């Protein structure tokens, strides 16, 4: 039946494609042409519609496609843009859950993680070959992403930017397949140049390529490598930035058989190079990750936990920590008698001194071509290859020697965190988009106003991973409706993992050990 | 508990 | 290419009271749509990655009646008239082999007495044209049969057919030199 | 950044830069096409963009370009059109002046003569070569001009004439390079 595609597709063309993939193709072709007209985009490539009608996927997508022949092989790099359609329902999957002696099945919709199967990709490749004529071409996966059903398609600015970013990545991957030279400390280490860095206690969120908010408590900014006394580059003005890492810190309530009860879980939510640089490679990513390490290694992250004193509406007010402590009460942090010293004491008794470094990993994110190696490095059939790629990336940064710090085959680079991440946003009182991750441990304690039993039910939902994830997802959504509100939109899900402490030691020390010295701007607190 | 792998490329 | 080891065919005879339209939106008369489907065993299927349908092809037939008096046989000789032949929308090609395979759908419309359902009365119509009761004007009654009312039975219907309509229809077709299948129909 | 830009500008493109410069590029492209349609200009020339976020420029510019191969040398001839913007602050020179017995400092925004330095010219050379593909070409400075910040871009007639004149100046410089016979009293 599915093998009749061999007859169905032999000749001719048809009238088809869903309403969103149709509209999306039309706007993306318009944007391509305007970008060429304004000379922002080069006219060396093609945009294609992938149909659920003409070919074998549940979800249609547009394909950002670039090509070159590399050493005789035709190579195509594709960055799919999934187009979910609110009016189209793909048949659901049966989730059978063996609840001890009780067996029950939950049916559920396929998300981009379930949709982007290995065959989904292979079908994308085949269609491109039909559309490009390159039937013997190899196709590079730049990472599928999704442009969600919900918003109006008239945002030409964002859509233009999506094409721009997607072609950037396509050029990188053709280049890196072509053998292009890597990013390294040697390029930064001018004989007359040094690095410096600071922690930004932002007070604001940051936004992905489609404009959705990303939680961050601290933005780590690594300054441009340079030195006073160097030749000024004519009449210029520039931001002195090299890269940045977005992160936040939760306070996880963790077991112990003497440590205090909460863990300073430092979570990377995003990794970006400064906007003036176009390329996106593993070496650039890996180098930037050292920015999160310094958050607790040299500086002190705990300043981010200070309550917004004077602000009534602080949903994550530290005062909530008193509900997990022996007080079983909110600390009065509204008062003129609440001091910096009292804050430090709450933490002395409640929060552990040893930082833990972890990060999100998203196969469908803005950095998916790279996120995918870090995800496969967690485990599975190609873990060894993904790990080899990552250690090679750091060695490219330092000129070898990562191996002088530890054995990557005894110490895999990233461990699973188990509980995965539901992403989404909610609207605040003025209708702005805010990250749903705000109901973190302090957030949830204030949301239940001290009802510890309600908190613990939620907390167990977010921690006990012997419970099938569908059951956990349903309870997590039930809790958002009661505590966050009904104005909640869900977005593409993601993985989380723990960076191996030895990977971290080797990355940070190896860079410092080759002379790429970085000064702290916050010289003392 | 298990890790699925999609069709990644370039690095392998 | 159809004989999958995990694939068989099955079909349905549709008796719905609505017309088809041709390539420029003009109506096509039929009584029965014969739809031939691909049925697979519930193991691994290609459609695990997509929404899918099983239609292979379709033949649209009209059931006629030829009046053949004998100055005996029931006076009306039915016929199965092919008014259209189509491939499923999934298949872009239109060839002789495909046309011929699809024609077997008309043949099967006469399995048992299924084809004769086209001769039934249908709901509530006060005065409408395909009413079998008109047959009473050619039969001994020389009158319209009261068929649209609550007093007309299934048994009376069967009797009108037993006396007026021969049980085995003639197969025939309409070949349009200017239709979408003209390359084939012209042969 | 310069050590990295060598290779990390090669892969990928971005949007951004001065909106006035984008408008200026767009109106010149429009006028270029009208001139071709009316046979005022031949379709034998290119117009490129010189812009802030790529080149660390001071002032943005449009570049009018002609090309020829002269006795085996690939030659690019260009005439930049500088575009000041009244809404954009430019860095100043710190001018220390020995006023009698005391030094005072006056700051002043760089003018077009302070910005269009030899190195600005060298970055024009390289930017055009990368946009034409003639990476080893010699580049001729046909004499730059300025399109001041102050006024409506609605004078299509002036802009059309600037393009025609820029093209002519470019042709004369290639003609000089190729040995075109001089004007003489003869």
mmCIF file of C-alpha atoms in Angstrom, chain A residues 63 138 177 198 267 331 409 466 488:
data_model
loop_
_atom_site.group_PDB
_atom_site.id
_atom_site.type_symbol
_atom_site.label_atom_id
_atom_site.label_comp_id
_atom_site.label_asym_id
_atom_site.label_seq_id
_atom_site.Cartn_x
_atom_site.Cartn_y
_atom_site.Cartn_z
ATOM 1 C CA UNK A 63 13.025 23.223 3.841
ATOM 2 C CA UNK A 138 24.117 13.206 0.757
ATOM 3 C CA UNK A 177 32.277 19.141 5.955
ATOM 4 C CA UNK A 198 30.828 39.808 34.337
ATOM 5 C CA UNK A 267 21.127 25.490 34.549
ATOM 6 C CA UNK A 331 10.178 34.618 56.067
ATOM 7 C CA UNK A 409 35.625 6.949 28.227
ATOM 8 C CA UNK A 466 9.780 5.933 37.825
ATOM 9 C CA UNK A 488 -0.629 29.090 29.295
#
